[PDB]
Design an enzyme around this catalytic site. Sequence first.
Site, PDB file in Angstrom:
ATOM      1  N   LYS B 149     -72.952  36.577  10.887  1.00  0.00           N
ATOM      2  CA  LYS B 149     -72.716  35.805   9.677  1.00  0.00           C
ATOM      3  C   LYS B 149     -73.575  36.353   8.538  1.00  0.00           C
ATOM      4  O   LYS B 149     -74.678  36.861   8.753  1.00  0.00           O
ATOM      5  CB  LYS B 149     -73.031  34.326   9.950  1.00  0.00           C
ATOM      6  CG  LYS B 149     -72.556  33.322   8.904  1.00  0.00           C
ATOM      7  CD  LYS B 149     -72.561  31.906   9.477  1.00  0.00           C
ATOM      8  CE  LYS B 149     -72.177  30.879   8.422  1.00  0.00           C
ATOM      9  NZ  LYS B 149     -72.530  29.482   8.810  1.00  0.00           N
ATOM     10  N   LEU B 198     -72.730  26.270   2.554  1.00  0.00           N
ATOM     11  CA  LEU B 198     -72.592  26.260   4.006  1.00  0.00           C
ATOM     12  C   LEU B 198     -72.138  24.902   4.538  1.00  0.00           C
ATOM     13  O   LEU B 198     -71.959  24.762   5.751  1.00  0.00           O
ATOM     14  CB  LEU B 198     -73.890  26.647   4.733  1.00  0.00           C
ATOM     15  CG  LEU B 198     -74.423  28.071   4.667  1.00  0.00           C
ATOM     16  CD1 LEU B 198     -75.597  28.203   5.606  1.00  0.00           C
ATOM     17  CD2 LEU B 198     -73.325  29.041   5.038  1.00  0.00           C
ATOM     18  N   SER B 224     -68.820  26.491   8.778  1.00  0.00           N
ATOM     19  CA  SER B 224     -69.169  27.508   7.797  1.00  0.00           C
ATOM     20  C   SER B 224     -69.069  28.949   8.293  1.00  0.00           C
ATOM     21  O   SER B 224     -69.082  29.879   7.494  1.00  0.00           O
ATOM     22  CB  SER B 224     -70.578  27.243   7.296  1.00  0.00           C
ATOM     23  OG  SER B 224     -70.935  25.897   7.562  1.00  0.00           O
ATOM     24  N   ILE B 245     -74.886  23.454  11.743  1.00  0.00           N
ATOM     25  CA  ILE B 245     -75.624  22.247  11.394  1.00  0.00           C
ATOM     26  C   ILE B 245     -74.712  21.039  11.245  1.00  0.00           C
ATOM     27  O   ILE B 245     -75.208  19.903  11.255  1.00  0.00           O
ATOM     28  CB  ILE B 245     -76.462  22.441  10.107  1.00  0.00           C
ATOM     29  CG1 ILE B 245     -77.698  21.535  10.126  1.00  0.00           C
ATOM     30  CG2 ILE B 245     -75.633  22.132   8.867  1.00  0.00           C
ATOM     31  CD1 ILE B 245     -78.623  21.707   8.933  1.00  0.00           C
ATOM     32  N   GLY B 246     -73.402  21.233  11.116  1.00  0.00           N
ATOM     33  CA  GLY B 246     -72.465  20.134  11.000  1.00  0.00           C
ATOM     34  C   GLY B 246     -71.133  20.426  11.661  1.00  0.00           C
ATOM     35  O   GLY B 246     -70.147  19.724  11.416  1.00  0.00           O
ATOM     36  N   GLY B 247     -71.094  21.466  12.491  1.00  0.00           N
ATOM     37  CA  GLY B 247     -69.883  21.868  13.176  1.00  0.00           C
ATOM     38  C   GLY B 247     -69.509  23.304  12.893  1.00  0.00           C
ATOM     39  O   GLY B 247     -68.443  23.773  13.282  1.00  0.00           O
ATOM     40  N   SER B 248     -70.422  24.020  12.255  1.00  0.00           N
ATOM     41  CA  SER B 248     -70.126  25.300  11.632  1.00  0.00           C
ATOM     42  C   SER B 248     -69.975  26.458  12.618  1.00  0.00           C
ATOM     43  O   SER B 248     -69.691  27.576  12.178  1.00  0.00           O
ATOM     44  CB  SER B 248     -71.213  25.602  10.598  1.00  0.00           C
ATOM     45  OG  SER B 248     -71.475  24.455   9.784  1.00  0.00           O
TER      46      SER B 248
END
Lengths: 551, 551
Positions: B149, B198, B224, B245-248
């Site tokens: 990434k 992100l 992200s 951090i949130g599903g990325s």
Amino acid sequence: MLTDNWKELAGKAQSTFQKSLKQAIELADFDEGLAKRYGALPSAIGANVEDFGSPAQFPLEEYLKALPKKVLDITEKDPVELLKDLKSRKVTCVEVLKAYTAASIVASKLTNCVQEFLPIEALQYAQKLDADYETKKHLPLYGLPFSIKEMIPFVGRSVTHGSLCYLDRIVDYNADIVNILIANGAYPFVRTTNPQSLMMLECVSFSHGRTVNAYNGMLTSGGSSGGEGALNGMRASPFGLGSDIGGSIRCPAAFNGIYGLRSTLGRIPTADYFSCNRGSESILSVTGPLSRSLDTVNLVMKTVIEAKPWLIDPTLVPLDWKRPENKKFRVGIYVSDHIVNPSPPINRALSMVTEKLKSLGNFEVVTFEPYKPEKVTEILGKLYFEDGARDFRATLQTGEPLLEQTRWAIEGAEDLDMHDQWYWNLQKQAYRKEFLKHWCSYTDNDGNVLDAVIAPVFPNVAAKHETTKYWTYTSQWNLLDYPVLAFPVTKVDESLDQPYKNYKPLNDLDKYFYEQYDSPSSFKNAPANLCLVGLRFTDEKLVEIANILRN
Amino acid sequence: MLTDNWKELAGKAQSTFQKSLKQAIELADFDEGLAKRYGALPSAIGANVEDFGSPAQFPLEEYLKALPKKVLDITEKDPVELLKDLKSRKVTCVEVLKAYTAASIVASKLTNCVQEFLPIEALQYAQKLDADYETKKHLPLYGLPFSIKEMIPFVGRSVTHGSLCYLDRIVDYNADIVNILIANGAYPFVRTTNPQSLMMLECVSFSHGRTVNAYNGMLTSGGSSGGEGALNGMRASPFGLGSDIGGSIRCPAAFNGIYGLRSTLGRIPTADYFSCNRGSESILSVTGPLSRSLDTVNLVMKTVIEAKPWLIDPTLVPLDWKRPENKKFRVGIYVSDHIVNPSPPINRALSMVTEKLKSLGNFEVVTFEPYKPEKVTEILGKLYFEDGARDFRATLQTGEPLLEQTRWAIEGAEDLDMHDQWYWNLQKQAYRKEFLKHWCSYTDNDGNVLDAVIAPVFPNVAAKHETTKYWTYTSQWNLLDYPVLAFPVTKVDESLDQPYKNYKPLNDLDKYFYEQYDSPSSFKNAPANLCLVGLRFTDEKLVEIANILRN
């Protein structure tokens, strides 16, 4: 291994067979009459390895009608008698090869028991054996061809045990037992079919299709040495070599009405065979001969063991092959393990053999009870595929489908931790020790041990396809490593073998086998065989008792 | 930080990409046939970062059609199998680089998943790795390239996480995990796209434009780590590293039908990555691999952890990567959180996986109910941007427009006073303790814990652009820091996945998602994935269960 698509590989397997079939017909040198009848035979070979053809109802009847006197006068001869003609030069080594090559071709089409013919090397073996007649006349198997299961290494060939992914696994050597037999005047001429994973009591693979019974083409040949049982049941080979880790020698022999010896581990060399789970030692397979002829079974064991194979294979014991001097016998009859009862044809075989032994003065005959036969499945359930079938499943990376019978063998397989294997090795050794005590509990007041037990090989005669869902009648003796000789008794009799009336099944699995035996007509002309079981290294007692039972 | 006009900056970002695209094409050395077909592919890259092109309807078939077999025979092979060829020297490291570089270029044009190619350094890595073949072939990842990434530092590059204002933020070092991977024989060859802030489950930025799904070009790649999901869904990278951090990580992997592991925080080094809110610790991101290959996900984890990364990153725990010793499994099925119901394709995937687990004897399967999922939004709503989004909003001093998805993530952010953070840290830790008790409430009478939960990654398959308005199906596990592995199940079937009818929505947001699923045709060929959830540090249990689900 290979990672090509399995359909391409099955083609490559078919090509190898068809290439060897073409060469075999040239060696056999059919006259037009046989070529005509051969062309018109119903085939158990399909257009592809998933197409199972349309086999004859009585493949053996078709075989005897199709082949000429010029062939049957040799292949129907007892191999020990044929060895006399080869020795006295009444028949040529090449003459015998030509007849048996022709027989195996007809047998191949009727039962689908041949994976690859070996006519090039077989002609070279037979030709030089004729040339060397004066110096090799003395060898105990001079001039005799024999068949080998595909899993047995032969120079320059792939060894696959039916898995398409191993078609590039070429060996440059023969199996030890093969070289020994060649050193004694024999030579292999055909490679017989074996099924996927080898762990089914039938003979289906994606290298060859489906192998069928020699006496009734609607039934299985058995397995895993299914080609061997069919080919030698058709008497299209003098004898063959199979393997037996769960019944894979005795089940084919019993289904095809011939003899098959699961010899005691440590007598004859087998470790260089190829299978799944190479390096697995918790439960070891054994080899041994199959033949129409008991005398031929005995002579192969005698020939191999007298060659002192422990000087090539150090796992073997230097124990002579010696006919027993016993004049009296104590014999037990194993009527049932009380988990799956035998079908009527097997049940009549037990009475027939019981009444014959009782009619001879020197046999004491007692009933033999089972000992915790459920533990056989439990222990073998953990040790057959102790890696959780990881090694086998890697063969399916080609996309090769999982056969229904293979599913049974690998379902529930655990990938054992070292401590798990230790636990089940101790369970294995405890059961063996407990069972010995059980066997010895039958010793009489004067101290005469049981010499042998007579038991079923299977809950029935040759099964319908995809119904061999109970192994204990053979795998019991793989867990124990006892020598077991399958031998013929009788054939299905439609009057005598009607289904049991008012039958009450013992459990769900027994009910399944009861319903499998819908009527004797479903198993018309199927051989009903039994087996003789002995304590470890008493193979010869079994041969001697089988000798008496056939006279 | 820069404050130049953002349009001038977008130019420089396009320029950096365009020069690396030229050099990548120079290394791949297309023959004229491929160069012509490549030129004629529909592009998802526009003339400017606001022009999203006209992507293919099915980018993956266009990828498979355009590339020669000389390339696909390497890139379509499972990387673990490809490692054998590099080990066996059947293929050279540079050869594998050339194929995957070519694959990534075709992937770049079809999906817009590459931010910058690394062909100069990749050739340096691959060439010297072949030269040192004899000494480094033993390394567990010898010769394998991988993607990173854009947020992951690489020597001599800007690290921007998609914000134009950070284009002069050049690092002279690699991320710890990258240096670990290079020491084990791998090397990065491409940097994948990441979106603004992100904090979206899509991949749109003013450094690259818009990244689209590998299976349906009208849908998002996810985010992200959208570039990683697209590139590895197209099998144009053996594996990649993302962040979550949130599903990325799990959203891109699920949208593109591959594997993606949100690993437990203390296991793999990620802190040296760049994002917004540097120094924020209330909620921490994690890293982990995305790949089409489960075996590769497992090997990367095993490889990095066995390098003892806690001796370079002191936030990490010295906890070995261990295959679980479990023989039986207890697994819960999480059908819905009862706030937003999943669309039919996800619901069918749940039934498929439930019934397959029920069909194996060694799995006990129970229903898993939610526990206060509403509180997930509440706590993360305060802790995701605990400075009131001041740090992110300052990146827009360039005039960089605020994307609609970013708006959702920063709307309502409070600039927390210390006491406000303390209150919500306690809210976070209390919920973590409560949820653990909830999970342990599923322990059976014999004391067997729940081993894993089966849950959606998102209320639907790959979303339509600008519709990812619900995070809980991934965020809940970031609030809890539970390891989660996304895994493939099925694809959309227009017959099987028609809209439910007579549906009564649970709330306005559930209605929004119901109307979003107008018909399966809008999501043609979209993979329907699920995920396996475990307790902290039970990552390997998830790998083992996913292993069984694919056998």
